[PDB]
Amino acid sequence: HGYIDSPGSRAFLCSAQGNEQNMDCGLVKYEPQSLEAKKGFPQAGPEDGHIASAGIGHFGALDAQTEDRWKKIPITAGEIEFQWEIMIQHKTSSWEYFITKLGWDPNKPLTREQFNSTPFCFEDYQEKMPSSRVINKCTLPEGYQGYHVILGVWTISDTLNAFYQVIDTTISPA
Ligand SMILES: [Cu+2]
Ligand SMILES: [Cu+2]
């Protein structure tokens, strides 16, 4: 169980510790650490249209997708660091990050077609137990600007599951 608090994830910003910068999030507000679903996105895992909720019904408020809906973290293109708060540590296969395609539609549901098919950042943890706070250093793909959604995936090595964290960003050109 864990969540990304820098850049603050969509679920994190729903929470009290995110100071409710997103509202009307349902139960997400009270357990942003709990977006657990089958590993293996995009070949498996949460179905299209339910990626942000990790396919969990009572987190479905996160599946709304409009330009106006979500608070966006401002970031500059290039190097980026993601920080996870690991409330319950589990042996870890990897940390990986996907981003929406150039030309995705911010007013349509998040789907595999809306995301690049492969991650832009991948850190192999070789099934080791992580510390309680984890930082992954990454680099954004070239040519990115504007509103984009980043999907953070924390894949658990000793279960069938992973934790899914979408992040809303406004990217300024490098
Ligand atoms: Cu857990
Ligand atoms: Cu419920």
TrEMBL record:
Cysteine disulfide links: 14-25, 121-138
Keyword Ligase: no
Pfam family, one: LPMO_10
Binding of Cu(2+), residues: 1, 90
Chain ranges of the Chitin-binding type-4 domain: 1-168
One Gene Ontology term of the molecular function aspect: metal ion binding
Keyword Phosphoprotein belongs to the record: no
Entry-linked InterPro entries: Cellulose/chitin-bd_N, GlcNAc_Chitin_IntDeg, Ig_E-set
Keyword entries, A-Z: Metal-binding, Signal
PANTHER family: CHITIN-BINDING TYPE-4 DOMAIN-CONTAINING PROTEIN (PTHR34823:SF1), GLCNAC-BINDING PROTEIN A (PTHR34823)
Protein name: Photorhabdus luminescens subsp. laumondii TTO1 complete genome segment 8/17
Organism: Photorhabdus laumondii subsp. laumondii (strain DSM 15139 / CIP 105565 / TT01)
